[PDB]
Coordinates of C-alpha atoms and ligand atoms in Angstrom, one line a residue:
Chain A
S1 CA 79.1 86.9 99.1
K2 CA 82.7 86.0 98.1
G3 CA 85.0 86.2 95.5
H4 CA 84.2 87.4 92.1
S5 CA 80.5 86.1 92.4
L6 CA 79.0 89.7 91.2
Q7 CA 82.0 91.3 89.3
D8 CA 82.3 88.5 87.1
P9 CA 78.9 88.0 85.7
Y10 CA 78.2 91.7 85.8
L11 CA 81.2 92.2 83.2
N12 CA 80.4 89.3 81.6
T13 CA 76.8 90.2 80.6
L14 CA 78.4 93.6 79.2
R15 CA 80.6 91.7 77.0
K16 CA 78.4 89.3 75.9
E17 CA 75.8 91.8 75.2
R18 CA 77.8 94.4 74.1
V19 CA 76.6 97.1 76.3
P20 CA 78.2 100.1 75.5
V21 CA 79.6 101.7 78.7
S22 CA 81.8 104.6 80.5
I23 CA 84.6 103.6 82.9
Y24 CA 85.5 106.1 85.2
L25 CA 89.5 106.0 86.4
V26 CA 90.2 106.6 89.8
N27 CA 92.5 109.9 88.2
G28 CA 89.4 111.2 87.0
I29 CA 89.6 110.0 83.4
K30 CA 86.7 108.7 81.5
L31 CA 86.9 106.0 78.9
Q32 CA 84.2 104.7 76.6
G33 CA 83.3 101.5 74.5
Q34 CA 82.7 97.7 74.7
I35 CA 84.3 95.4 77.2
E36 CA 85.9 93.0 74.4
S37 CA 87.4 90.9 77.3
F38 CA 88.8 90.8 81.0
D39 CA 90.4 89.2 83.9
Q40 CA 91.7 89.2 87.3
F41 CA 93.6 92.2 86.2
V42 CA 92.6 93.9 83.4
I43 CA 89.7 94.6 80.6
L44 CA 90.1 95.1 77.3
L45 CA 88.2 98.1 76.0
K46 CA 87.4 98.4 72.1
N47 CA 86.6 101.8 70.8
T48 CA 87.2 103.9 68.0
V49 CA 90.7 103.1 69.2
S50 CA 90.8 99.6 71.4
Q51 CA 92.7 99.8 74.7
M52 CA 93.6 97.7 78.1
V53 CA 93.0 98.7 80.8
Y54 CA 94.2 97.6 84.6
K55 CA 90.9 97.3 87.0
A56 CA 93.5 98.6 90.1
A57 CA 93.0 101.6 88.4
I58 CA 89.4 102.0 87.7
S59 CA 86.8 104.0 90.0
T60 CA 83.3 102.6 88.5
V61 CA 81.7 100.9 85.6
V62 CA 78.5 102.2 84.6
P63 CA 76.5 100.8 81.6
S64 CA 74.6 103.4 79.5
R65 CA 71.5 101.0 79.8
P66 CA 70.3 99.0 83.0
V67 CA 71.4 95.5 83.1
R68 CA 70.2 92.2 84.5
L69 CA 72.2 89.6 86.3
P70 CA 71.2 85.9 86.4
Chain B
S1 CA 95.8 85.9 81.6
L2 CA 94.5 88.6 78.6
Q3 CA 97.3 91.4 79.6
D4 CA 100.4 88.5 78.8
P5 CA 99.1 87.7 75.0
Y6 CA 98.5 91.2 74.4
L7 CA 101.9 92.8 75.6
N8 CA 104.0 90.2 73.9
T9 CA 102.1 91.2 70.6
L10 CA 103.0 94.4 71.2
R11 CA 106.3 93.6 72.0
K12 CA 106.4 91.4 68.7
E13 CA 105.2 93.7 66.6
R14 CA 107.3 96.5 68.2
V15 CA 103.3 98.5 67.8
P16 CA 103.9 102.6 69.4
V17 CA 102.0 102.7 72.7
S18 CA 100.9 105.4 75.1
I19 CA 101.1 104.1 78.2
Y20 CA 98.9 106.3 80.9
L21 CA 99.6 106.8 84.4
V22 CA 97.9 106.3 87.1
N23 CA 98.1 110.2 87.8
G24 CA 97.5 111.1 84.4
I25 CA 101.0 111.2 82.7
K26 CA 101.4 110.0 79.6
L27 CA 104.7 107.7 78.3
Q28 CA 105.0 106.8 74.7
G29 CA 107.2 104.4 73.5
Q30 CA 107.4 100.9 72.1
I31 CA 107.0 97.8 74.6
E32 CA 110.3 96.3 74.8
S33 CA 110.2 93.6 77.7
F34 CA 107.9 93.0 80.6
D35 CA 107.4 90.8 83.5
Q36 CA 104.4 90.4 85.5
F37 CA 105.1 93.9 87.7
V38 CA 107.2 96.1 85.8
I39 CA 107.3 96.9 81.3
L40 CA 110.3 98.5 79.9
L41 CA 109.1 101.1 77.7
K42 CA 112.0 101.7 74.7
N43 CA 112.3 105.0 73.0
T44 CA 115.0 107.6 72.5
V45 CA 115.2 106.5 76.3
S46 CA 114.5 103.6 77.9
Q47 CA 112.4 103.2 81.2
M48 CA 111.2 100.8 83.3
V49 CA 107.6 100.9 84.4
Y50 CA 105.9 99.9 87.3
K51 CA 102.5 98.3 86.3
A52 CA 101.2 99.2 89.4
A53 CA 101.2 102.9 88.0
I54 CA 99.3 102.0 84.9
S55 CA 95.9 103.0 84.0
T56 CA 95.9 101.9 80.6
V57 CA 97.9 101.3 77.5
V58 CA 96.6 102.3 74.0
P59 CA 98.3 101.0 70.9
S60 CA 98.6 103.4 68.2
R61 CA 96.7 101.0 65.9
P62 CA 94.5 97.9 66.1
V63 CA 95.7 95.1 66.7
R64 CA 94.5 91.5 67.3
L65 CA 95.5 88.2 69.5
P66 CA 95.5 84.7 68.1
Chain C
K1 CA 89.1 88.7 110.7
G2 CA 88.9 90.9 107.4
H3 CA 85.5 89.9 107.0
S4 CA 83.8 89.9 110.4
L5 CA 82.6 93.4 110.2
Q6 CA 82.9 94.5 106.4
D7 CA 80.3 92.0 105.3
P8 CA 77.9 92.1 107.9
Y9 CA 78.1 95.4 107.6
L10 CA 77.6 95.7 103.8
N11 CA 75.1 92.9 103.9
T12 CA 72.7 94.8 106.5
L13 CA 73.0 98.1 104.8
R14 CA 71.8 95.5 101.6
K15 CA 68.9 93.3 103.3
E16 CA 67.5 96.9 105.1
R17 CA 67.7 98.7 101.3
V18 CA 69.5 101.6 103.6
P19 CA 70.6 104.7 101.3
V20 CA 74.1 105.1 101.6
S21 CA 76.8 107.7 100.8
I22 CA 80.1 106.0 99.1
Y23 CA 83.1 108.6 98.9
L24 CA 85.4 107.5 96.5
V25 CA 89.0 107.6 97.0
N26 CA 89.9 110.8 94.6
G27 CA 86.9 112.7 96.5
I28 CA 84.1 112.0 94.4
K29 CA 80.8 111.1 96.5
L30 CA 78.1 108.3 95.3
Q31 CA 75.0 107.8 96.5
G32 CA 72.2 104.8 96.7
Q33 CA 71.7 101.6 97.8
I34 CA 73.7 98.1 98.2
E35 CA 72.0 96.0 95.5
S36 CA 74.7 93.6 95.8
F37 CA 78.7 93.2 96.2
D38 CA 81.2 90.4 96.6
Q39 CA 85.5 90.6 97.6
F40 CA 86.4 92.8 95.1
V41 CA 83.5 95.3 93.9
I42 CA 79.7 96.9 94.8
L43 CA 76.6 97.7 93.2
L44 CA 75.2 100.6 93.7
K45 CA 72.0 101.4 92.4
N46 CA 70.5 104.6 92.2
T47 CA 68.4 106.3 89.5
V48 CA 71.9 105.1 87.2
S49 CA 73.1 101.9 88.7
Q50 CA 77.2 101.2 88.8
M51 CA 79.3 98.8 89.8
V52 CA 82.4 100.5 92.3
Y53 CA 85.9 98.8 93.1
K54 CA 86.5 98.6 96.6
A55 CA 90.1 99.5 96.4
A56 CA 88.8 102.6 94.8
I57 CA 86.1 103.7 98.0
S58 CA 87.5 105.1 100.9
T59 CA 84.4 105.5 103.1
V60 CA 80.7 104.0 103.2
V61 CA 78.2 106.2 105.0
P62 CA 74.9 105.4 106.1
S63 CA 72.2 107.8 105.9
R64 CA 70.9 106.9 109.3
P65 CA 72.4 104.4 112.1
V66 CA 73.2 101.0 111.3
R67 CA 73.1 98.6 114.1
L68 CA 75.2 95.1 113.4
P69 CA 73.7 91.9 114.4
Chain D
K1 CA 107.2 86.0 84.3
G2 CA 107.9 86.9 87.9
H3 CA 110.5 89.6 88.6
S4 CA 112.6 88.5 85.7
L5 CA 113.0 91.6 84.1
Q6 CA 112.9 93.6 87.7
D7 CA 115.3 92.3 89.0
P8 CA 118.4 92.1 86.4
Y9 CA 117.1 95.8 85.5
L10 CA 117.9 96.8 89.2
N11 CA 120.4 94.8 89.8
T12 CA 122.4 96.2 86.9
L13 CA 122.1 99.7 88.0
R14 CA 123.2 99.1 91.5
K15 CA 126.3 96.6 89.8
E16 CA 127.3 99.7 87.5
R17 CA 126.5 102.5 89.7
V18 CA 124.1 104.0 87.1
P19 CA 122.3 107.5 88.0
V20 CA 118.7 107.4 87.3
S21 CA 116.0 109.5 88.5
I22 CA 112.7 107.8 90.0
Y23 CA 109.4 109.2 89.5
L24 CA 107.2 108.7 91.9
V25 CA 103.2 108.0 91.3
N26 CA 102.7 111.6 92.3
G27 CA 104.7 113.0 89.8
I28 CA 107.7 113.7 92.0
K29 CA 111.6 113.0 90.8
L30 CA 114.4 111.5 93.2
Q31 CA 117.6 111.2 91.9
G32 CA 121.2 108.9 92.4
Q33 CA 122.0 105.9 92.7
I34 CA 120.6 102.2 93.6
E35 CA 122.2 100.6 96.3
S36 CA 120.3 98.2 97.3
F37 CA 116.7 96.6 96.7
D38 CA 114.1 94.2 98.3
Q39 CA 110.9 92.8 97.2
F40 CA 109.4 96.0 98.4
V41 CA 111.7 98.7 98.8
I42 CA 115.1 100.9 97.5
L43 CA 117.6 102.3 98.6
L44 CA 118.3 105.4 96.9
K45 CA 121.9 106.9 97.6
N46 CA 122.6 110.5 97.1
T47 CA 124.1 113.3 99.6
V48 CA 121.0 112.2 100.9
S49 CA 120.0 108.5 101.4
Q50 CA 116.3 107.3 101.4
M51 CA 114.2 103.9 101.2
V52 CA 111.7 104.2 98.7
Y53 CA 108.5 101.9 98.5
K54 CA 108.1 100.6 95.2
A55 CA 104.7 101.0 95.5
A56 CA 105.0 104.3 95.4
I57 CA 107.5 104.4 92.4
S58 CA 105.8 105.5 88.5
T59 CA 109.0 104.8 86.6
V60 CA 112.9 104.3 86.7
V61 CA 114.2 106.3 84.0
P62 CA 118.4 105.3 83.9
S63 CA 120.8 108.3 82.5
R64 CA 122.3 106.3 80.5
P65 CA 121.0 102.9 78.1
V66 CA 121.6 99.4 80.2
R67 CA 122.4 96.2 78.7
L68 CA 119.9 94.1 79.8
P69 CA 121.4 90.9 81.3
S70 CA 121.9 91.8 85.4
Chain E
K1 CA 101.3 87.2 114.0
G2 CA 100.9 89.4 110.9
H3 CA 99.4 92.3 113.0
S4 CA 101.7 92.7 116.1
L5 CA 100.9 96.5 116.5
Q6 CA 98.3 97.3 114.5
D7 CA 95.9 95.1 116.5
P8 CA 97.0 96.6 120.0
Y9 CA 97.1 99.5 118.5
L10 CA 93.4 100.2 117.5
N11 CA 92.4 97.9 120.2
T12 CA 93.6 100.2 122.9
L13 CA 92.3 103.4 121.2
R14 CA 88.4 101.0 120.9
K15 CA 89.1 100.4 124.6
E16 CA 90.1 103.6 125.9
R17 CA 87.2 105.4 123.6
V18 CA 90.3 107.5 122.5
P19 CA 88.8 110.8 120.0
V20 CA 91.1 109.7 117.1
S21 CA 91.6 111.7 113.5
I22 CA 92.2 109.2 110.4
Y23 CA 93.7 111.2 107.5
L24 CA 93.3 109.7 104.2
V25 CA 95.6 108.8 101.3
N26 CA 93.2 111.9 99.3
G27 CA 93.6 114.6 102.1
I28 CA 90.5 114.3 104.0
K29 CA 90.1 114.2 107.5
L30 CA 87.9 111.8 109.6
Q31 CA 86.9 112.2 113.1
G32 CA 85.3 110.1 116.0
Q33 CA 86.2 106.8 117.9
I34 CA 86.9 103.6 116.7
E35 CA 84.2 101.4 117.4
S36 CA 85.5 98.3 115.9
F37 CA 87.8 96.8 113.0
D38 CA 88.7 94.0 111.0
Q39 CA 91.4 93.4 108.6
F40 CA 90.0 95.5 105.9
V41 CA 88.1 98.2 107.6
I42 CA 87.8 100.2 110.3
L43 CA 83.8 101.5 111.9
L44 CA 84.0 105.2 112.8
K45 CA 81.4 106.7 115.1
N46 CA 80.7 110.2 115.4
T47 CA 77.0 111.5 114.4
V48 CA 77.0 108.1 113.0
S49 CA 79.0 105.0 112.1
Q50 CA 81.1 105.2 108.7
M51 CA 83.0 102.1 107.4
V52 CA 86.5 103.7 106.2
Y53 CA 88.6 100.9 104.0
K54 CA 92.1 100.6 105.6
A55 CA 93.8 100.9 102.0
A56 CA 92.2 104.0 102.0
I57 CA 93.8 105.8 105.4
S58 CA 97.4 107.4 105.2
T59 CA 97.6 107.9 109.2
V60 CA 96.2 107.5 112.7
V61 CA 96.4 110.1 115.0
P62 CA 95.0 110.2 118.7
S63 CA 94.0 113.3 120.4
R64 CA 96.0 112.3 123.4
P65 CA 99.4 109.7 123.9
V66 CA 98.0 106.3 124.0
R67 CA 100.1 103.3 125.5
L68 CA 100.7 99.7 123.9
Chain F
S1 CA 115.9 90.8 96.4
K2 CA 113.8 88.7 98.3
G3 CA 111.5 89.8 101.2
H4 CA 112.0 92.6 103.6
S5 CA 115.8 91.4 103.7
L6 CA 116.8 95.3 103.2
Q7 CA 113.6 97.0 104.5
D8 CA 114.0 95.1 107.9
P9 CA 117.3 96.1 108.7
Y10 CA 116.7 99.6 107.5
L11 CA 113.6 100.1 109.5
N12 CA 114.9 98.2 112.4
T13 CA 117.9 100.6 112.3
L14 CA 116.1 103.8 112.4
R15 CA 114.7 102.4 115.4
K16 CA 117.3 101.2 117.7
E17 CA 119.7 104.1 117.1
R18 CA 116.3 106.6 117.4
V19 CA 117.2 108.4 114.5
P20 CA 114.9 111.5 113.6
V21 CA 113.3 110.9 109.9
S22 CA 111.1 112.6 107.6
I23 CA 108.4 110.1 106.2
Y24 CA 106.9 112.0 102.7
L25 CA 103.4 110.3 102.0
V26 CA 102.1 109.5 98.6
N27 CA 99.8 112.5 98.6
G28 CA 102.8 114.6 99.2
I29 CA 102.2 115.2 102.9
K30 CA 105.5 115.0 105.0
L31 CA 105.4 113.7 108.7
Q32 CA 108.5 113.9 111.1
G33 CA 109.4 111.5 114.6
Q34 CA 111.3 109.0 115.7
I35 CA 110.4 105.0 114.3
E36 CA 109.4 103.7 117.5
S37 CA 107.8 100.9 116.0
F38 CA 106.8 99.0 112.6
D39 CA 105.2 95.7 111.3
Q40 CA 104.5 94.0 108.1
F41 CA 102.1 96.9 107.6
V42 CA 102.7 99.9 109.5
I43 CA 104.9 102.5 110.9
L44 CA 104.6 103.9 114.6
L45 CA 106.3 107.4 114.3
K46 CA 106.8 108.8 118.0
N47 CA 106.2 112.7 118.0
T48 CA 104.3 114.4 120.4
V49 CA 102.5 112.1 120.0
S50 CA 102.2 108.5 118.4
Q51 CA 101.0 107.9 114.9
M52 CA 100.2 105.1 113.1
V53 CA 101.2 105.0 109.7
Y54 CA 100.5 102.3 106.6
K55 CA 103.0 101.7 104.5
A56 CA 100.6 101.4 101.8
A57 CA 100.3 105.7 101.7
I58 CA 104.0 105.9 102.1
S59 CA 106.5 106.8 99.0
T60 CA 110.0 107.7 101.4
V61 CA 111.7 107.4 104.2
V62 CA 115.0 109.8 104.7
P63 CA 116.3 110.0 107.4
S64 CA 117.9 113.1 109.0
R65 CA 121.6 112.2 109.2
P66 CA 123.8 109.0 107.4
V67 CA 122.9 105.7 108.4
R68 CA 124.8 102.6 107.9
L69 CA 123.6 99.0 107.6
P70 CA 125.1 96.2 109.2
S71 CA 127.6 94.3 106.8
Ligands
ZN1 ZN1 83.5 88.3 100.5
ZN2 ZN1 87.1 87.4 88.3
ZN3 ZN1 101.8 86.8 83.4
ZN4 ZN1 99.4 90.9 65.3
ZN5 ZN1 68.7 97.3 110.9
ZN6 ZN1 94.4 92.0 112.8
ZN7 ZN1 112.7 89.3 93.2
ZN8 ZN1 108.9 93.1 107.5

């Protein structure tokens, strides 16, 4: 296992399938919404209010319903 | 990147944003300028922010990238 | 030299479905099984599955002895 | 855009011996003048001089406005 | 080089099987013996082996003095 | 402006002249001792006794007395 071989498809699936996710920050704050876009550094989280999240600040990404990866 | 168009949009359009630090602290103002590692946030006081200490950037209003 | 320990270790936990505790850098403790992982993240399965960034992990503690191949 | 903003800013602050406050990621506030810097550290001069790792800095806040050109 | 200090330091602790304290950036204190290590993690053996990410480590403190 | 052009001379100086220093960690903690050595990633802090410190965990290094740098 190497590179983003898991992260990319995982996030890309949450995105393509517009899955409601909770994103827990290292500082203990919880964000919620849908992944609109992402790259090596950040994730765009769309909600009542959209926002750009730095991945280096993310602890865990918890999908609201189970997700199967290709 | 997603980061560059995003921030440059906020800059160009002078969008009021809230930057939450990696320690919970919130900063408010406008993205005056930025490079790969820092952002200049202009308010009644202008200040340089290290991206590495940012958790999330939240625009006051919705924005769209071309 | 960076992978020679980490990957065999994570893979072994994965292959043998060993229950692990994953302590986060903010002091929170997660539990489950290592379903998959790459260079940057780990997929942890419990009743509720979740993706964990390695950069937020301090330590990984298996529920029982794990021998490296 | 690389250091295009960071170098000029820091170099300007150093050149003009501008008083600054440096807030660390842990909320701690340092104060004094930027005497020098490299890719990783800043030398902050005051009654006590000290070497600050950039990785530990949240924000750098000048005591007065600065003109952008290095 | 890249590791001219870190490697010999950790290797010596691994060889002499010296009991060490590993303080994490978040305060917590781990204890045991360095069983093995690579560039990014340390395997710390106590009641059972735990893998410690180097990025989360503040300081490594041996129970007794060590010569490089 | 590039590399450890400042970090190395400074750290090398503290080591050469065996200056007592305080090293404040990102978590607030404060370590004291003398810089015995360092490389790209860590600093060896000689006290009673020697402690390896990750640079990634350090916020600031404060010498006990003023320190001049070469040229
Ligand atoms: Zn890998
Ligand atoms: Zn990716
Ligand atoms: Zn860019
Ligand atoms: Zn627009
Ligand atoms: Zn086994
Ligand atoms: Zn090495
Ligand atoms: Zn530069
Ligand atoms: Zn160096």
